[PDB]
Structure 1
Amino acid sequence: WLVANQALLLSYAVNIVAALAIIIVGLIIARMISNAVNRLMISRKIDATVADFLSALVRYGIIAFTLIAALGRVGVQTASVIAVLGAAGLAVGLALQGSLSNLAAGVLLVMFRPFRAGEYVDLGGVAGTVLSVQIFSTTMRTADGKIIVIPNGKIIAGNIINFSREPVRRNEFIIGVAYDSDIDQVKQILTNIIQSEDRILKDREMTVRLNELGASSINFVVRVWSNSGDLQNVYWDVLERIKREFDAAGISFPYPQMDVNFKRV
């Protein structure tokens, strides 16, 4: 009988009063925090539907938190709701793995700087000048003139070749001449063409060596070092001069040779 010779009914009364207190302060704290986030988002920047589900999801989250806290305050065991809610949080955490990976990689590309804005690089077989580095992705304009947006988590997970870091780079040529050409003559013509060029650095190597005895031609290699801004112009100028002086000196560039053994008359 409930003749009240006990204090457990007092404990039950303070439990239901505490549950109603949790409900009403959860409602008003949800309202005030939604108002504060709504005030601090409009002043800074908003998208309409994005800020809508932002404030809505924060409000539903804090309402669900205070509702199951009030259910647990009464005496209802709420561990299944916490299990489903933790599984849903882990699902959202697996969903946002690539985005947060791009964000962490974007932080690392700002702290450590392998490349900066205006530096010709290569990011996994994609070459071009870096325009800007942002939090999720970098934009880079190629030599063709097209803009490529690459996420940061793929930038760091691969090699990042930087062309504009070292001021001195190397050209390489494969000059195929005929088998009947003199080795010393072709070598001294190529040496004169290399040493008569002022933008080829003389303190580095100036290799002119027979590299390969190919199918229809002996291939010479010539490797010269220039500044990184003069590289393509040195390539074009010395290639044109190689062609002009080999045509002037009688050295022939062979076609795809073939021997034919004639039969059946």
Structure 2
Amino acid sequence: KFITPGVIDFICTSLIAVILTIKLFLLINQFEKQQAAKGRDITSARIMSRIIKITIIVVLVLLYGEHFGVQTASVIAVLGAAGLAVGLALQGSLSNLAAGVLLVMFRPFRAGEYVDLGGVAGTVLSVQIF
């Protein structure tokens, strides 16, 4: 019917990607709710959620490049290098983010609990992203 083979494959790949993204976003929402109503505030949870959403969007764009080389290849070649350079410079940022996520998950101390962290004692106000 004058239909070039490949349209069905494109549709199925797009649908699979959409389902994967929806599941990832549901997981992000569950994680954000757990962080919020466990020990964390709202601003940090929202920031973490939107960071995860941006990361998923970036991974989608990177994987979507298998269709056209003039749509994402002309931009992915720079985005990947910039992200790698930032991660190399920002390694401490990711380390702090992971440590904060662990502190929210495992609760050695809660807000309003007098603690001593390496010679610096005082009441804990809130655990933020970094």
1:82 Cα deviation after fit: 5.0
Check if 1:66 corresponds to 2:60. Answer: yes
Check if 1:81 corresponds to 2:80. Answer: no
Q: Distance in 2 between matches of 1:81 and 1:45?
A: 38
Q: Distance in 1 between matches of 2:39 and 2:64?
A: 35
Query: Pick from 24, 27, 31: which aligns with 2:21?
Result: 27
Query: 2:92 matched to which residue of 1?
Result: 97
1:98 Cα deviation after fit: 7.8
1:30 Cα deviation after fit: 3.2
1:37 Cα deviation after fit: 1.1
Q: Distance in 1 between matches of 2:13 and 2:61?
A: 9
SS of equivalent to 1:139: coil
Query: 1:37 matched to which residue of 2?
Result: 31
What TM-score comes out, normalization by structure 2 length? 0.56
Query: 1:125 matched to which residue of 2?
Result: none
**5+ long unaligned stretches in structure 1:** 104-130, 142-146, 148-265
SS of equivalent to 1:44: coil
Task: Determine what percentage of the aligned residue pairs are the same residue.
Answer: 12
Select the structure of larger CA radius of gyration.
1
1:55 Cα deviation after fit: 0.5
Size of the aligned set, in residue pairs, is 103
Spell out, residue by residue over 1:168-203, the C-alpha distance to the aligned partner (whole angstroms, 9 max, x if none).
Answer: xxxxxxxxxxxxxxxxxxxxxxxxxxxxxxxxxxxx
Q: Distance in 2 between matches of 1:44 and 1:34?
A: 15
Spell out, residue by residue over 1:147-179, the C-alpha distance to the aligned partner (whole angstroms, 9 max, x if none).
Answer: 9xxxxxxxxxxxxxxxxxxxxxxxxxxxxxxxx
**5+ long unaligned stretches in structure 2:** 99-114, 123-130
1:66-215 mapped onto 2 (5 Å cutoff): 66-72=60-66, 75-77=67-69, 78-79=72-73, 80-81=75-76, 83-97=78-92, 100=95, 132=116, 134=117, 138-139=118-119
Spell out, residue by residue over 1:87-128, the C-alpha distance to the aligned partner (whole angstroms, 9 max, x if none).
Answer: 224314413438849x9xxxxxxxxxxxxxxxxxxxxxxxxx
1:23 touches 1:67 (CA, 8 Å); kept in 2? Answer: no
